[PDB]
Amino acid sequence: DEVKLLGMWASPFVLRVQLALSLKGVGYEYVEEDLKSKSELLLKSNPVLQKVPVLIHDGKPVCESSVILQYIDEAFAGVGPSLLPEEPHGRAVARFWAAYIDGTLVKASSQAKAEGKKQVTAAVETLEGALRDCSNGKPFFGGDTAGYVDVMLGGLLAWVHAGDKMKGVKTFDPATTPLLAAWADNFGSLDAVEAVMPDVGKLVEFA
Amino acid sequence: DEVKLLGMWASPFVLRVQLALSLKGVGYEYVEEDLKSKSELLLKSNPVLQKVPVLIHDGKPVCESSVILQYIDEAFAGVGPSLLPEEPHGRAVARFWAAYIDGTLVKASSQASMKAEGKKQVTAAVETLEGALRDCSNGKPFFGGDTAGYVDVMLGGLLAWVHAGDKMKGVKTFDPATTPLLAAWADNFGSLDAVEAVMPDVGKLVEFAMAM
Ligand SMILES: CC1=C[C@H]2O[C@@H]3[C@H](O)C[C@](C)([C@]24CO[C@@]1(O)[C@H]4O)[C@]3(O)CSC[C@H](NC(=O)CC[C@H](N)C(=O)O)C(=O)NCC(=O)O
Ligand SMILES: CC1=C[C@H]2O[C@@H]3[C@H](O)C[C@](C)([C@]24CO[C@@]1(O)[C@H]4O)[C@]3(O)CSC[C@H](NC(=O)CC[C@H](N)C(=O)O)C(=O)NCC(=O)O
Ligand SMILES: CC1=C[C@H]2O[C@@H]3[C@H](O)C[C@](C)([C@]24CO[C@@]1(O)[C@H]4O)[C@]3(O)CSC[C@H](N)C(=O)O
Ligand code: NA
Ligand code: NA
Numbered sequence: 001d002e003v004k005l006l007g008m009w010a011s012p013f014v015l016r017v018q019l020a021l022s023l024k025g026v027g028y029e030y031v032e033e034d035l036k037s038k039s040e041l042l043l044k045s046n047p048v049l050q051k052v053p054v055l056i057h058d059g060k061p062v063c064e065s066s067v068i069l070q071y072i073d074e075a076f077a078g079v080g081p082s083l084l085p086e087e088p089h090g091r092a093v094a095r096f097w098a099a100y101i102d103g104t105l106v107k108a109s110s111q112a113k114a115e116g117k118k119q120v121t122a123a124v125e126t127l128e129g130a131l132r133d134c135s136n137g138k139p140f141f142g143g144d145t146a147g148y149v150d151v152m153l154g155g156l157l158a159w160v161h162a163g164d165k166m167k168g169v170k171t172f173d174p175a176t177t178p179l180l181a182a183w184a185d186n187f188g189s190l191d192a193v194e195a196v197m198p199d200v201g202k203l204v205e206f207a
Numbered sequence: 208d209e210v211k212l213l214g215m216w217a218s219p220f221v222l223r224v225q226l227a228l229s230l231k232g233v234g235y236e237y238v239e240e241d242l243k244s245k246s247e248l249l250l251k252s253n254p255v256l257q258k259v260p261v262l263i264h265d266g267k268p269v270c271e272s273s274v275i276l277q278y279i280d281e282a283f284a285g286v287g288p289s290l291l292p293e294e295p296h297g298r299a300v301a302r303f304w305a306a307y308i309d310g311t312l313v314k315a316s317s318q319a320s321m322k323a324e325g326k327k328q329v330t331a332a333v334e335t336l337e338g339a340l341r342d343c344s345n346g347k348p349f350f351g352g353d354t355a356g357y358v359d360v361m362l363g364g365l366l367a368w369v370h371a372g373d374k375m376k377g378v379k380t381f382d383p384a385t386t387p388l389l390a391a392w393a394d395n396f397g398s399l400d401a402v403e404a405v406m407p408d409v410g411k412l413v414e415f416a417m418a419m
């Protein structure tokens with residue numbers, strides 16, 4: 001398609017890029033990376049970090065899921081809806097919660113063991129507040145349609161579901177964070193999301 | 208037209224915001240926060256993280272230095288030069304190197320500052336950033352070209368904190384012998400009037416570092 005994703009099926013960072021491409025309806029070639037013996041194309045395309053996702057558009061590689069999400073938004077502006085808000089302030093809000101998901105939630109969630117689990121439920125509690133304040137009674141961070149923040153968090157949903165099914169816990173417990181519980185179901189049930197969301201059972205085996 | 212910056216004189220993250228405002232020529236109110244006893248305005252403006260910088264433009268706060276730089280770029284468009292490249296690819300390169308400075312260089316120099324292992328990672332990251340400069344600059348003085356751009360400000364924000372460390376240690380982080388492009392860059396960016404106007408006294412930074 002002249003759009004190539006260097007991927008790994010179990011990565012939430014790769015799932016972010018798949019979700020962004022799917023929501024717009026941009027076609028792409030998926031290439032599965034073996035991260036134990038990395039491809040020539042991966043090592044040439046991301047020489048500094050050697051991680052997936054990499055998006056290659058028209059010979060030019062793009063690295064880091066949040067950078068890729070923004071790239072997609074700028075380069076495919078005329079194809080399907082935008083993830084980023086139109087106005088500077090709304091964009092600043094979206095990038096803030098993007099930074100928080102990666103800098104706070106993922107630092108804690110990857111670390112989660114007891115002490116890490118204290119930080120995870122604190123970060124989830126904050127994200128319940130983010131959703132109430134961003135959404136304004138609408139289903140998503142982006143409003144009536146899924147936006148940047150929804151994709152950054154939505155990318156981690158299968159990872160979160162697998163973790164939950166292993167432990168016997170709900171990260172998005174309806175008793176504690178009802179808005180996030182409903183959001184996981186609403187985002188999860190989008191046709192564009194269901195088309196790329198990996199089987200949870202398969203994730204569990206991998207981990 | 209009200210720009211208030213909730214700052215701390217020793218923060219490289221704050222100095223990023225000052226650099227961007229200075230390079231554009233946007234006026235702002237600098238407010239020095241005490242991070243030991245945080246103000247009511249800081250606690251209300253950044254309720255989730257309680258960190259400086261916060262930029263308040265017409266009553267609306269913005270948090271996280273890299274987010275703030277991009278906001279200024281979007282909100283003050285055609286006041287002075289833009290920090291971000293025009294084309295999506297060049298912006299993706301600029302955002303990549305921004306993420307690398309925060310995620311790799313700063314993570315390593317904090318681990319160095321709290322020793323050999325961290326010194327391996329700092330040297331490694333500076334080496335990589337020599338390559339970023341060669342590839343980004345295209346024979347011009349800066350990452351953003353003939354004028355400073357986003358990457359120059361993200362790295363430029365750490366120059367005071369680098370120079371104090373270097374002053375106390377007797378070492379160059381941007382050593383001419385090992386990263387000559389970065390050494391020339393540090394001198395070029397540091398000699399800009401817009402940079403010089405907000406660059407803290409090294410001697411006061413030395414003392415502050417020495418306390419920690
Ligand atoms: C929350 C969470 C989920 C897990 O998902 C995958 C797996 O289940 C374990 C794993 C380590 C973690 C464990 O915790 C995780 O944070 C994560 O890291 C995982 O491999 C990560 S994905 C492969 C990885 N890529 C990135 O890190 C990209 C990050 C980049 N900032 C982006 O945004 O583009 C890579 O390529 N590593 C190099 C190599 O493996 O050789
Ligand atoms: C390289 C480096 C320099 C030092 O600079 C300042 C000081 O010299 C010591 C200090 C801790 C370090 C020590 O090593 C440093 O990494 C950093 O950590 C320092 O206080 C940091 S600035 C104040 C801090 N802000 C942020 O962290 C914002 C980051 C955010 N991602 C952004 O981008 O907005 C805050 O507001 N903290 C709240 C509280 O103090 O309660
Ligand atoms: C007296 C002060 C002046 C003022 O100058 C610059 C700017 O306008 C805001 C700033 C933070 C201050 C705020 O009050 C200050 O103390 C200083 O901290 C500043 O970036 C300092 S850089 C330059 C100078 N070498 C220094 O270190 O003083
Ligand atoms: Na952070
Ligand atoms: Na909010």
Ligand code: NA
Pocket residue numbers: 142143144145
């Ligand atoms: Na909408």
Ligand code: NA
Pocket residue numbers: 230231287288354355
């Ligand atoms: Na300039």
Ligand code: NA
Pocket residue numbers: 251252253254268
């Ligand atoms: Na606020």
Ligand code: NA
Pocket residue numbers: 273301302303305306
């Ligand atoms: Na960035």
Ligand code: NA
Pocket residue numbers: 306307310311
């Ligand atoms: Na990084």
Ligand code: NA
Pocket residue numbers: 230354355401
């Ligand atoms: Na300039």
